Amino acid sequence: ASIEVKVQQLDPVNGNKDVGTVTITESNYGLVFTPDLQGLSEGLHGFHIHENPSCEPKEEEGKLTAGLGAGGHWDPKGAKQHGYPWQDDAHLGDLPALTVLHDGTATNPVLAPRLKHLDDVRGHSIMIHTGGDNHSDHPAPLGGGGPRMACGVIK
Amino acid sequence: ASIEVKVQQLDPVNGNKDVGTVTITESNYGLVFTPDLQGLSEGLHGFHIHENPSCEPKEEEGKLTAGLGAGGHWDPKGAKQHGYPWQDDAHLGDLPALTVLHDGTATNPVLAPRLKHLDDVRGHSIMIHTGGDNHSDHPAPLGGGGPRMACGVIK
Numbered sequence: 001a002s003i004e005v006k007v008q009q010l011d012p013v014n015g016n017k018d019v020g021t022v023t024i025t026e027s028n029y030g031l032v033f034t035p036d037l038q039g040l041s042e043g044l045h046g047f048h049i050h051e052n053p054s055c056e057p058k059e060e061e062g063k064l065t066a067g068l069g070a071g072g073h074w075d076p077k078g079a080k081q082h083g084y085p086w087q088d089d090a091h092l093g094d095l096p097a098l099t100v101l102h103d104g105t106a107t108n109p110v111l112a113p114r115l116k117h118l119d120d121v122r123g124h125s126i127m128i129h130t131g132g133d134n135h136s137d138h139p140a141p142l143g144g145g146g147p148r149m150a151c152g153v154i155k
Numbered sequence: 156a157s158i159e160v161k162v163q164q165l166d167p168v169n170g171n172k173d174v175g176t177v178t179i180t181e182s183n184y185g186l187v188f189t190p191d192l193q194g195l196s197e198g199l200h201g202f203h204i205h206e207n208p209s210c211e212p213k214e215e216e217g218k219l220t221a222g223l224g225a226g227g228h229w230d231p232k233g234a235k236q237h238g239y240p241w242q243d244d245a246h247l248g249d250l251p252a253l254t255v256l257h258d259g260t261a262t263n264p265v266l267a268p269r270l271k272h273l274d275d276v277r278g279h280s281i282m283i284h285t286g287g288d289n290h291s292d293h294p295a296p297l298g299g300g301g302p303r304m305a306c307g308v309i310k
């Protein structure tokens with residue numbers, strides 16, 4: 001079983017652009033997210049499951065903000081803090097950082113040990129940030145992910 | 156946990172050079188390897204625990220080859236197959252690939268779900284290859300890691 005998520009670079013002005021997919025599979029140690037993306041800025045990128053199954057933008061203080069429609073990091077256990085994928089008292093949506101190579105592609109799979117079944121993540125969104133993820137709210141909030149650069153809805 | 160492993164770039168001729176550390180800690184989901192490395196080549200690199208507690212070279216067909224003193228991938232359960240970090244019938248030493256950014260640094264931690272206790276890795280070595288890791292023995296053996304670029308002995 002698997003879930004192929006279509007991911008798009010968010011552009012509230014001229015329209016979202018397809019950048020590939022992220023395929024979710026189950027392993028004996030948790031859900032595995034295998035990316036097949038391209039056209040992205042090289043480096044480490046914050047990667048988390050957000051609460052709403054939406055990648056639409058939302059007006060925030062006069063600005064149509066990319067991906068705000070997805071809401072915050074998925075936190076069904078009410079951890080109320082950003083952490084490591086292997087930290088029990090961190091948002092359940094906190095996944096390992098995504099690696100984008102020099103050529104703008106991302107194909108390295110990552111494991112989210114706290115997620116066990118595919119049905120558990122359906123009805124939410126996967127977000128890729130412009131910044132990275134140090135898995136802490138220190139010194140920057142939410143791992144320093146910053147703006148939402150790409151997103152897909154898990155169905 | 157906390158075992159700070161000193162890592163060196165391997166050069167049997169010109170001499171080895173310090174490139175930083177890899178700190179190993181225990182999490183509720185397995186051992187976490189947190190790198191703090193510099194001076195490495197950009198890209199994903201094969202990252203595995205090798206059997207011998209040595210990073211010394213060894214003669215291969217008359218050629219003193221970097222890191223061969225470390226032996227092969229640590230495979231205490233006799234999987235005799237290279238695979239994913241979350242694959243039970245793969246070498247127990249198979250870790251997630253290490254990400255080295257454009258600037259040559261690596262700070263992104265990775266989880267090895269099948270390694271449960273610090274002591275299990277003591278008495279072995281941690282290897283960073285020149286090539287990447289597709290977590291398979293095809294089309295290249297041992298994930299295509301190829302030559303051994305950097306290494307550290309786990310005390």
Ligand SMILES: [Cu+2]
Nearest residue numbers: 042102197257
């Ligand atoms: Cu680059």
Ligand SMILES: [Cu+]
Nearest residue numbers: 047048127145
């Ligand atoms: Cu996020």
Ligand SMILES: [Cu+]
Nearest residue numbers: 202203282300
């Ligand atoms: Cu290796």
Ligand SMILES: [Zn+2]
Nearest residue numbers: 073082091094
């Ligand atoms: Zn979070």
Ligand SMILES: [Zn+2]
Nearest residue numbers: 228237246249
């Ligand atoms: Zn292996």
